[PDB]
Design a protein around this ligand. Sequence first.
Ligand SMILES: O=c1ccn([C@@H]2O[C@H](COP(=O)(O)OP(=O)(O)O[C@H]3O[C@H](CO)[C@@H](O)[C@H](O)[C@H]3O)[C@@H](O)[C@H]2O)c(=O)[nH]1
Lengths: 291, 290
Amino acid sequence: VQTMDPEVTLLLQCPGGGLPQEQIQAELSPAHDRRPLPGGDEAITAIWETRLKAQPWLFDAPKFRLHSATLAPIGSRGPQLLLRLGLTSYRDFLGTNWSSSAAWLRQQGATDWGDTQAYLADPLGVGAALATADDFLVFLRRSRQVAEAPGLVDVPGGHPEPQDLAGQLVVHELFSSVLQEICDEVNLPLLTLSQPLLLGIARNETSAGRASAEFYVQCSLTSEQVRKHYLSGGPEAHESTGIFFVETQNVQRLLETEMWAELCPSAKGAIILYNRVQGSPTGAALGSPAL
Amino acid sequence: VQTMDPEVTLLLQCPGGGLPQEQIQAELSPAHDRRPLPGGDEAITAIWETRLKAQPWLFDAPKFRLHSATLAPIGSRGPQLLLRLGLTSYRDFLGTNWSSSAAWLRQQGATDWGDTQAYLADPLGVGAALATADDFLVFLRRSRQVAEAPGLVDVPGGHPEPQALCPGGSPQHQDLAGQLVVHELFSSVLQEICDEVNLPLLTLSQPLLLGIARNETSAGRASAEFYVQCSLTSEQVRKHYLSGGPEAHESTGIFFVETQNVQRLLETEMWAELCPSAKGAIILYNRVQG
Ligand SMILES: O=c1ccn([C@@H]2O[C@H](COP(=O)(O)OP(=O)(O)O[C@H]3O[C@H](CO)[C@@H](O)[C@H](O)[C@H]3O)[C@@H](O)[C@H]2O)c(=O)[nH]1
């Protein structure tokens, strides 16, 4: 499903209102992993060592890989969504998605396996349309020290990391990770946050199609209280350089403004899915039983 | 009655031909319900929470409980078959028949009440040998997201709903008339075929009951197995099933087998793809319909 702004495409769009954790299953399997490059993965090793010469402190972290997502039959007795996930890493991401030869990898991939992403790490990111009690969406200015989308506008992010029921632990890890990041980066108490709702999955084409799962999260605080909580942490309590707010009523028309050029690809996917899927009621995160 | 597959036993085999709906009566009574477990129904509650953690989409719904069945001599006035039914639920079903203690429950029941099923929920399922105009039986492959027998090949079937006779909810035995219950059993069969195969009701004949088989992996849970004919051919049936794409249904494929092969069906590698309840339907079909 192609959207406007060619930086962004939609892999998954959930039905209206979004989907809760309880209606989602995950399948985590080696069959969902990246395919070994044509040929040899030491090309990844070469890039990793070429970087790391310039930045010796770089560390490789494990990530979930998105292979595919399938919506179930409308109003069915099973889960409404199945996520097929593999394992990948930051090292493989730098060596494939962000490598110069990334364009070569997608063509050879769709040729060989009939899937452009077959030779790409495709780590699954997470993002959130965080809505305030007085109906604003929260945005964050990225610090200029980052190589990816420097100085641009973002939404609260995250990165889940790997640790029947196995699939539910993964589903749980994904949903928990967006709450954990909102608390850490925006400095909000967990009590003030609703249970997240998945809105869909968007692909960043500037990243050669890395997907990001986009969630809706409601905050019981007003836009003024959030800002205070954010600032009260001080410059070192968050890795963004500042926060601001846009009325939910103005979010739909937002792409007319000069702000859209400020937004990073991930945040765009979040806004687009928010406008299309919209929100629905959920209770306090603390009121839901943890697994 | 040993059926020959240790996964299947026959509780009842109908005459003919199979029995039409007009010849069958149901009696509901709280005496046909499950006896309260010695430990308690709290053991059922613990198992329910555990199953929900793995599959949150599971829902508890009321079910008919099969207690027993009795045939009468043909020519006798009134029903030739009486089904004695209780009320149970999907929660009780997972907490008893699919409990790890199931074998221990069947023993306690045998000792105490002289009935292996005494402490088991035993919801009554329905299934259908569905023949097409060009003489194939129809088969469907189960999803992996089901609570039991994931990924196995099955016949059309499902659970009759007591809540269908009294939409008010929380059903009592006195709220459910015998003839309406028998009707719900026969109608749930036709409706399952319509919903999962996307076949029009007008193409389906009135189901004939072949008998009742037990699923020994589910600790003897019983299913009623019906014979139903379709006026459409295998090809047309496949087309109907295919409209809407793979996500039109939760089943993952439709398959056809010649009725002549059905007789020998379990000398074939197809047999090893079948869940127990589908094995029950084939064994009764072969025996009652040929
Ligand atoms: O009350 C219910 C009923 C169904 N489900 C779920 O929806 C699915 C419905 O499957 P269904 O086929 O209707 O019941 P099963 O118990 O899963 O399957 C058994 O019952 C069917 C009809 O009796 C047979 O065809 C199958 O072979 C037999 O395995 C179940 O797996 C469950 O996941 C519930 O959560 N609560």
